[PDB]
Structures are given as structure tokens and as C-alpha cells.
Design a binder for this molecule. Structure first.
Ligand SMILES: *[C@@H]1O[C@H](CO)[C@@H](O)[C@H](O)[C@H]1NC(C)=O
Ligand SMILES: *[C@@H]1O[C@H](CO)[C@@H](O)[C@H](O)[C@H]1NC(C)=O
Ligand SMILES: *[C@@H]1O[C@H](CO)[C@@H](O)[C@H](O)[C@H]1NC(C)=O
Ligand SMILES: *[C@@H]1O[C@H](CO)[C@@H](O)[C@H](O)[C@H]1NC(C)=O
Lengths: 99, 50, 37
């Protein structure tokens, strides 16, 4: 997805603190057709590759607010702690392997 | 063939004479392999009509 | 699918739903099949 680089100093060392694992058909871009049906809190979408699956969005309707796309991973995977809904599952590094 | 993974490393065993396999190679990866596939062999004349 | 790069899309039978029945067999390790040195 285009990790380019981390802008750091000359002698900075980078270390992570939260490692996440996904599946092998994971796409953070939303579907480009359910964005053509929602109004409130509209998402960003694009074309995902051959085999991947987009982000799911609920079509929520209430008495104060109309049809809005209630999708996962809000605010962020680092602080959303109803985490059976955003695919980026938290992990811990095993022996011999990288984050 | 045996193909397995353990602690970043990939291990391959093979045999052609007999049933038990012997060690072919190992390879450090640092990652976890999650899927495999057997490719279809588009041949010309191997079929039932051949 | 396998990759995500369009190499060739000539002669693509994309209009089908019949999953090929694959095969089955039973493993039998009784004579050494499945072991190594
Ligand atoms: C780090 O790089 C980005 C992109 O080149 C730039 O926008 C940002 O200002 C840089 N950081 C600093 C402190 O200059
Ligand atoms: C190949 O198999 C078919 C199946 O019935 C049979 O009719 C044919 O004679 C076989 N040909 C050879 C060369 O074995
Ligand atoms: C895939 O590449 C071939 C090149 O021969 C092209 O004709 C075809 O339109 C491409 N497929 C798509 C979906 O663009
Ligand atoms: C799948 O293709 C075969 C031949 O290519 C055909 O006989 C069969 O009806 C097809 N099934 C479907 C659901 O399209």
C-alpha cells in the first residue's frame, strides 16, 4: 500500500509498540458502490486487487439520524476496543520472527 | 515431500527411492507462510482421449 | 486469486459454478509413509 519511509533524524532508531496481523485478502479501502448510497459520514473508497475484500459498512437508520454508513475501525485500531469487528487483530511477536 | 515451518525457518525433506524422506534444505525467512497452491499443468496430449 | 496481476485473460472460462469434486484417500503410516530420518 505504499509505505514509503519514516522521516527520522540521522541516528534515529525506530521501534514499534503495537503489532497487528491481518488476513491475506484484507483491503482498507471501502467499496466504491456503497459510498454511492450513503450521505452522513461518507467513506473513502477505491479499487481493491484480485482476491481482496473491502471494508464492511452497516446501513444504520434511526429517528434522529437517517441512513448512515456505520463502518468498523473507528476511531482507530490502536484505540477501538470492541476489537472483534476491525480485521487488524493485535498480536505479540514470536521467537525468530518479525512484527 | 515434507514442507514445514518453525520459528522463522522453512524445512524441506524429500524422497524418490522409498517411503521415508531425507533432508533437502532449510531457509530462514522471519515471516510465517500461510497458503500454498498446486498449479494446473496445461499440457496437450496426456488425457483420456490420448 | 493467486496473484493480482493481469498477465493474460485470453480463453478465460469465468462463467461456471460447478466445483470439481477433488478426490479423497486415507493416510496409512503403517509401512513408514509419513516419516523421515
Ligand atoms: C518529514 O518529511 C515529510 C515529508 O517529506 C515532511 O512533510 C515533514 O515536514 C518532515 N518533518 C520535519 C520535521 O520536517
Ligand atoms: C484410452 O482410454 C479410453 C477410455 O475408454 C479407451 O477407449 C482407449 O482405448 C484408451 N487408449 C489407449 C491407447 O490406451
Ligand atoms: C488484461 O491484459 C490483456 C492484454 O492482452 C487485455 O487485453 C485485457 O483487457 C486486460 N484485462 C483487463 C481487465 O484490463
Ligand atoms: C459449467 O460449465 C460446463 C461446461 O463448461 C457446463 O456443462 C455447466 O452447465 C456449467 N455450469 C454452470 C452453472 O454454468
Amino acid at each position: 500500500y505504499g509505505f514509503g519511509s519514516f522521516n527520522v533524524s540521522s541516528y534515529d532508531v525506530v521501534y514499534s509498540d503495537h503489532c497487528f496481523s491481518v488476513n491475506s485478502d484484507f483491503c482498507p479501502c471501502a467499496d466504491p458502490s456503497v459510498v454511492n448510497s450513503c450521505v452522513k459520514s461518507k467513506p473513502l473508497s477505491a479499487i481493491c486487487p484480485a482476491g481482496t475484500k473491502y471494508r464492511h459498512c452497516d446501513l444504520d437508520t434511526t429517528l434522529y439520524v437517517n441512513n448512515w454508513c456505520r463502518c468498523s475501525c473507528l476511531p482507530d485500531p490502536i484505540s477501538t476496543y470492541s476489537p472483534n469487528t476491525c480485521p487488524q487483530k493485535k498480536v505479540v511477536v514470536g521467537i525468530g520472527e518479525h512484527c | 515431500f515434507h514442507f514445514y515451518q518453525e520459528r522463522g525457518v522453512f524445512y524441506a525433506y524429500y524422497a524418490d527411492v522409498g517411503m521415508p524422506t531425507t533432508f533437502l534444505f532449510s531457509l530462514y525467512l522471519g515471516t510465517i507462510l500461510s497458503h500454498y497452491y498446486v498449479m494446473p499443468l496445461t499440457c496437450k496430449a496426456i488425457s483420456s482421449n490420448t | 486469486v493467486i496473484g493480482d496481476f493481469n498477465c493474460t485473460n485470453s480463453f478465460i472460462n469465468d462463467y461456471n459454478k460447478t466445483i470439481p469434486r477433488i478426490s479423497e484417500d486415507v493416510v496409512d503410516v503403517s509401512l513408514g509413509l509419513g516419516t523421515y530420518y
